[PDB]
């Protein structure tokens, strides 16, 4: 890292001079809690048939969505104190913060 600079690097590298990659692009996320995988280190809960999580069957994500999230659109409540721009800035800001790559 340069002893002195004038602007941000494009990758975020060198923002933190003691630990140059912190906040820089193409680096693993930090973990605020230890990860919880079916095998302890790699497989996601719900991977292996019949394997429970913490004493209970893993609920299908699509089943949770159908039973708890799904609702009749005519019931929609327009937020009287928020604009749709509130939603949009949120997504734009998200896209300044994180993108988690996947294989093509």
């Amino acid at each position: 890292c340069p002893e002195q600079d004038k602007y941000r690097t494009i990758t975020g590298m060198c923002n933190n001079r003691r630990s140059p990659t912190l906040g820089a692009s193409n680096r693993a996320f930090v973990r605020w809690l230890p990860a919880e995988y079916e095998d302890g280190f790699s497989l996601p809960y719900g991977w292996t048939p019949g394997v429970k999580r913490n004493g209970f069957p893993v609920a299908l994500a699509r089943a949770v969505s159908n039973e708890i999230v799904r609702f009749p659109t005519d019931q929609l409540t327009p937020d009287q104190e928020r604009s749709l721009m509130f939603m949009q800035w949120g997504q734009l800001l998200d896209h300044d913060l994180d993108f988690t790559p996947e294989p093509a």
Binding site: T11, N15, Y37, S42, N54, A59, P78, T100, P101
Partner: protein, 466 residues
């Protein structure tokens, strides 16, 4: 195994299985496509699998400039010394700039309308075209950079292309920071959580880890609960712009052709300002436009965003609801009755217990968006904690935070305190009447609107090198 065309569960695919009596997918041999997030250390029998952030965690407008050097270079107009970002060479929006087109192998935007042949847009981030409202925001910031570079060139004749680009990029970054922390976050968190997690800024602390936490990538998806089922477009007097003022969201995903051929970003920006967001209620969590018909036009089957969020948290090995509550110093309900009290909703607690068996296993997004919203906020205690904690780190652990001593002069900071999203819209579009601040609260025309001529522009005088 092709995760998009097969339902076989083999690396790197983790397809979502279909439950019996599904309201849409009656064929249980089908599935919802899902690719596992790339592991930070592929094939290891030593490391605990982690995922990768391809972007800079800092609030530095990397969605405008790019987070990698080759891209950042390609997004720049290198044909002169004006320090501008490259603009679309084939199309304009009422004489104004559009983002350049991208060159993608399998362009999804092309599939949203075969005969229009409008590819996806090229931006600092790869998702600029995911919805036309987002593209409009990217396009707005591209224009503001070029507008800033132009004024700067007049004030400082000796500044070369590089200097103009960096100075305009530095201003845009501070604008994203100001709009986000001054206007946006207080309305996300509410007053109490805002004061608790974002106390008054002191100065740069090089011991504050600024990385995005893996959990934040799923928790901040709370915004999915704010999504309306339509894209609303309004004409210059804020009336439904004919003949298609309310397009179903399932026909706008990656529909870049709508920006180019259906009136530019003005109708879209006016729609965002004068239409209410959707409110998150405990039995009105997220709409079927994203729950049943996500990306329906650009693939074999419509996805389910809420379900993807939950499958993603599992892919990422994220702890369940009670573990995150504990992390946050919040009580951890163990019975349906205790969960009922925490959610102030017994009926929702029962549904969650029927699905999960225990509040320990509730997936973080589901548990987070299930909590009652904090007063004057749009997230509950758990999400407020995760989101508030993340943004304080992105602020305090950023050496280039706009208020950090040495980044801007006192008069430059005084000037920047006058910026606003409404003004930026005024400076870069044909829109002459915009929302009063706070733009994220105002949503009713004409009650909440004012003339652009009443909003003082950013005064760049203190940027004079003289």
């Amino acid at each position: 195994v092709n995760c998009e065309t097969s339902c076989v569960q083999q690396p790197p695919c983790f397809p979502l299985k279909i439950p019996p009596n599904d309201p849409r997918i009656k064929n249980q041999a089908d599935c919802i496509p899902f690719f596992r997030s790339c592991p930070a250390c592929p094939g290891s029998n030593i490391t605990i699998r982690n995922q990768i952030n391809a972007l800079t965690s800092f609030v530095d407008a990397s969605m405008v400039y790019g987070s990698e050097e080759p891209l950042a270079r390609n997004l720049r107009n290198m044909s002169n010394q004006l320090g501008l970002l490259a603009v679309n060479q084939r199309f304009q929006d009422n004489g104004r700039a559009l983002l350049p087109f991208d060159n993608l192998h399998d362009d999804p935007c092309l599939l949203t309308n075969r005969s229009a042949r409008i590819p996806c847009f090229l931006a600092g981030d790869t998702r600029s075209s995911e919805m036309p409202e987002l593209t409009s925001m990217h396009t707005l910031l591209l224009r503001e950079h070029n507008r800033l570079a132009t004024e700067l060139k007049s004030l400082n004749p000796r500044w070369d292309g590089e200097r103009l680009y960096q100075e305009a990029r530095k201003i845009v970054g501070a604008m994203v920071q100001i709009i986000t922390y001054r206007d946006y976050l207080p309305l996300v968190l509410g007053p109490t959580a805002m004061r608790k997690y974002l106390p008054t800024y002191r100065s740069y602390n090089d011991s504050v880890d600024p990385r995005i936490a893996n959990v934040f990538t799923n928790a901040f998806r709370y915004g999915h609960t704010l999504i309306q089922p339509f894209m609303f477009r309004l004409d210059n007097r804020y009336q439904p712009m004919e003949p298609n003022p309310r397009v179903p969201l399932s026909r706008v995903f990656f529909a870049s052709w709508r920006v180019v051929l259906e009136g530019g970003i003005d109708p879209i920006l006016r729609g965002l300002m004068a239409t209410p967001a959707k409110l998150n209620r405990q039995n009105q969590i997220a709409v079927d436009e994203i729950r049943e018909r996500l990306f329906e036009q650009v693939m074999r089957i419509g996805l389910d965003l809420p379900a993807l969020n939950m499958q993603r948290s599992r892919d990422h090995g994220l702890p369940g609801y009670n573990a995150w509550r504990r992390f946050c110093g919040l009580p951890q309900p163990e019975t349906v009755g205790q969960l009922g009290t925490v959610l102030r909703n017994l009926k929702l607690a029962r549904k969650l217990m029927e699905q999960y068996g225990t509040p320990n296993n509730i997936d973080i997004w589901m548990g987070g968006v299930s909590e009652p919203l904090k007063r004057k906020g749009r997230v509950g205690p758990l999400l407020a904690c995760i989101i508030g904690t993340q943004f304080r780190k992105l602020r305090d652990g950023d050496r280039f935070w706009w208020e950090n001593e040495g980044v801007f002069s006192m008069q430059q900071r005084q000037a920047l305190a006058q910026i606003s999203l409404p003004r930026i819209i005024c400076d870069n579009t044909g829109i002459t009447t915009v929302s009063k601040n706070n733009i994220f609260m105002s949503n009713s025309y004409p009650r909440d609107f004012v003339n652009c001529s009443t909003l003082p522009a950013l005064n760049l005088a203190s940027w004079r090198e003289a």
